[PDB]
Amino acid sequence: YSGRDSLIFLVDASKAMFESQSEDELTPFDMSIQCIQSVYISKIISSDRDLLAVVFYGTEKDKNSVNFKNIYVLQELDNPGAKRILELDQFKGQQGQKRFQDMMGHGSDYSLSEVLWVCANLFSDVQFKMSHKRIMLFTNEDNPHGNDSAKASRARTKAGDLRDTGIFLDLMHLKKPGGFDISLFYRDIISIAEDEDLRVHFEESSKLEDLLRKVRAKETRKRALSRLKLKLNKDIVISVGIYNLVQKALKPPPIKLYRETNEPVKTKTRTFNTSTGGLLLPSDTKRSQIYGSRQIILEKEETEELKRFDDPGLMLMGFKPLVLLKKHHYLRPSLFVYPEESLVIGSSTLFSALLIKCLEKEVAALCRYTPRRNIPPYFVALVPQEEELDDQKIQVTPPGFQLVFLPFADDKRKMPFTEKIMATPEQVGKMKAIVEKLRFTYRSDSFENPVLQQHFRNLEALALDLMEPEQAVDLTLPKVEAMNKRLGSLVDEFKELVYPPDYNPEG
Amino acid sequence: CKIPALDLLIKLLQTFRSSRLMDEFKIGELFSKFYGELALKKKIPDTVLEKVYELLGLLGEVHPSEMINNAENLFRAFLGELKTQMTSAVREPKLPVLAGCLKGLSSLLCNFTKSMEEDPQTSREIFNFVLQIDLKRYAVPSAGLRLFALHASQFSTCLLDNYVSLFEVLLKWCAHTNVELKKAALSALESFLKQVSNMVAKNAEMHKNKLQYFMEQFYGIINKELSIAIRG
DNA sequence: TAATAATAGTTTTTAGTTTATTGGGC
DNA sequence: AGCTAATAAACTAAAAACTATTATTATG
């Protein structure tokens, strides 16, 4: 865990945010609010347990507790909800903006120091462990608070103060026809870990394209599967963390709730004497398995100890070259092992030495693995995956041992096999050409389950109670027309090459 | 079901310990519903919530016959639970709150039934006799000692065994720290000695236990332990 | 006289049960 | 022209991890 995330959005309640160079372009307030909607939807599906708030500045009215003028808070730091989405969308649009300007003011003098006070106080309100005091704001101009030198000085003083307090903030470039005026008033006063300010950005060219994009995932935090241990012989033991860099996600379980109250009704379940109508007890339980006629009775710890073979841990078997593993031999999704000094101190040194040595030897680690108590231990192989970096020196692959599992004899399922049949080499060349026609470079993040996407689409659609639900796009459908036009007549050429001209492959 | 349930349960328990037989006679249905909710096959309540066992310890009513009928169900449940717990082979000897709570339950329940006329008597004998080492100020041993002290009588004709082991374990228990454990062990001492004397005095083999149990330790005594020796 | 140390309270996977399930039959 | 079996999916309980706190003893 080690902290949580929270963002607060700041919108200039002025008239510059309520115009457009051309009607094809929305107002700054318009694309800001729609990007806010997209961000909130993403947070709900991704990390709904975070904190989000909305505050406005420059408006005529105000709502902050300290009651600084022009400082109207809209929403406080809370887990996002569809109600907030509705509150935002009631003013999102070419007329909802007018509704907002009617029921709410816009355009007045203020001090950025005041909004910084308000946001700092809002930070003070939250109490859970917190890690990312990210602040987001939206405008296309900087100099209005540089107009008053005293206002500029106090604003930059408070900005330095909040930077000292660990607060991090980010601004979106908005389309100002005369240029946002980078480097004039903000990047010297705002918090940046890097400098790319080169163009005063007459347009809104910054990272809205990423933010408006909707993501659909869960992004489970880095949680150690176990600090399980490797028993070398009987006493040489090291502490290593267990991880799964891939973990099959699935649709969240439903919650059974009422009809007219919609309340999730608790469901107590028990067992009673059917022959009597009385009541039975968990102690009054006996499991049976009848093979033919004889009935055999087993109990709780009776069924437990049959699963008992050894203590949960890793028991080294030996070493074998990596090549001696058949690729088609697969059991289930692989695991990953990372060292740790939390329990066994110096175990990281041993892990590094083993990784380097076995990488030199090109050998695999054979070991007996017991996940937890009362489980049959299974043999596994630890292939050393070296940490690989990129042009950005980011870990495209972390260091450690990828944990692949070794199937047993029962796993092997033989099938009715046939003889070996060969093919003419010219047909093989035709296949090579046809493959080259439709070849491409695979990338892992280029594909996704459309079924869960459609599930989400429906979920937020009924949440947003529109006329129609959003339609997900299947990225797993082949481009049949594109592939066919890309191949040409080679398809039918090989069809007559191999398949009989009179007999189609269809029966 | 959390600290709310914990505090409410202790409140009502001490209420019965205070309010004793004035109007608290609308509890038979309450007792039945508590027994039923125990039969919830999902043991999701925490061990701390298992002081519901002390709930079944009930004396504020006349203890109607229906409570007697359900008492056998209760006892069987406790026996199954305890035999499940004490099996350290399954590496689940964890009954920290369970043991003392079922102890108090048996304490306030045995006042009506379970005379020394059946096998379950020696069963629960063996169950308690197992009193592997403990920690955390040793609450469960004190609970067991208090239970035995209150109901040493029911263990007749089968408590004479293990007499040396019982005596030495009681000695060390009253010699250990946590003076509350000391006095609980002392009470167990007096109850045990009283019961063994009563059963020996009308025995026929009394000389065997006599010369094999008592004068040697008594002489070897010669601290508050001296008072126990004199009583012995 | 008063600080520290095992402890449960949330998720989180995960590993058994349950079910409605297209094919042949003749 | 009548007949039904593996089965992934769903549904459970169950077990661990990972925080978050505290019944205990020196000790005056």
UniProtKB/Swiss-Prot annotation, chain A:
<keyword id="KW-0539">Nucleus</keyword>
<dbReference type="GO" id="GO:0005634">
    <property type="term" value="C:nucleus"/>
</dbReference>
<keyword id="KW-0233">DNA recombination</keyword>
<dbReference type="GO" id="GO:0045860">
    <property type="term" value="P:positive regulation of protein kinase activity"/>
</dbReference>
<dbReference type="GO" id="GO:0000976">
    <property type="term" value="F:transcription cis-regulatory region binding"/>
</dbReference>
<dbReference type="GO" id="GO:0005654">
    <property type="term" value="C:nucleoplasm"/>
</dbReference>
<dbReference type="GO" id="GO:0008094">
    <property type="term" value="F:ATP-dependent activity, acting on DNA"/>
</dbReference>
<dbReference type="GO" id="GO:0030332">
    <property type="term" value="F:cyclin binding"/>
</dbReference>
<keyword id="KW-0597">Phosphoprotein</keyword>
<keyword id="KW-0238">DNA-binding</keyword>
<feature type="modified residue" description="N6-acetyllysine">
    <location>
        <position position="307"/>
    </location>
</feature>
<protein>
    <recommendedName>
        <fullName>X-ray repair cross-complementing protein 6</fullName>
        <ecNumber>3.6.4.-</ecNumber>
        <ecNumber>4.2.99.-</ecNumber>
    </recommendedName>
</protein>
<dbReference type="GO" id="GO:0003684">
    <property type="term" value="F:damaged DNA binding"/>
</dbReference>
<dbReference type="GO" id="GO:0006303">
    <property type="term" value="P:double-strand break repair via nonhomologous end joining"/>
</dbReference>
<comment type="function">
    <text>Single-stranded DNA-dependent ATP-dependent helicase that plays a key role in DNA non-homologous end joining (NHEJ) by recruiting DNA-PK to DNA. Required for double-strand break repair and V(D)J recombination. Also has a role in chromosome translocation. Has a role in chromosome translocation. The DNA helicase II complex binds preferentially to fork-like ends of double-stranded DNA in a cell cycle-dependent manner. It works in the 3'-5' direction.</text>
</comment>
<feature type="modified residue" description="Phosphoserine">
    <location>
        <position position="489"/>
    </location>
</feature>
<feature type="modified residue" description="Phosphothreonine">
    <location>
        <position position="424"/>
    </location>
</feature>
<keyword id="KW-0511">Multifunctional enzyme</keyword>
<dbReference type="GO" id="GO:0016887">
    <property type="term" value="F:ATP hydrolysis activity"/>
</dbReference>
<keyword id="KW-0804">Transcription</keyword>
<dbReference type="GO" id="GO:0070419">
    <property type="term" value="C:nonhomologous end joining complex"/>
</dbReference>
<keyword id="KW-0945">Host-virus interaction</keyword>
UniProtKB/Swiss-Prot annotation, chain B:
<comment type="similarity">
    <text>Belongs to the PI3/PI4-kinase family.</text>
</comment>
<protein>
    <recommendedName>
        <fullName>DNA-dependent protein kinase catalytic subunit</fullName>
    </recommendedName>
</protein>
<comment type="function">
    <text>Serine/threonine-protein kinase that acts as a molecular sensor for DNA damage. Involved in DNA non-homologous end joining (NHEJ) required for double-strand break (DSB) repair and V(D)J recombination. Must be bound to DNA to express its catalytic properties. Promotes processing of hairpin DNA structures in V(D)J recombination by activation of the hairpin endonuclease artemis (DCLRE1C). Recruited by XRCC5 and XRCC6 to DNA ends and is required to (1) protect and align broken ends of DNA, thereby preventing their degradation, (2) and sequester the DSB for repair by NHEJ.</text>
</comment>
<comment type="subunit">
    <text>DNA-PK is a heterotrimer of PRKDC and the Ku dimer (composed of XRCC6/Ku70 and XRCC5/Ku86). Formation of this complex may be promoted by interaction with ILF3. Component of the core long-range non-homologous end joining (NHEJ) complex (also named DNA-PK complex) composed of PRKDC, LIG4, XRCC4, XRCC6/Ku70, XRCC5/Ku86 and NHEJ1/XLF. Additional component of the NHEJ complex includes PAXX. Following autophosphorylation, PRKDC dissociates from DNA. Interacts with DNA-PKcs-interacting protein (KIP) with the region upstream the kinase domain.</text>
</comment>
<feature type="repeat" description="HEAT 1">
    <location>
        <begin position="161"/>
        <end position="196"/>
    </location>
</feature>
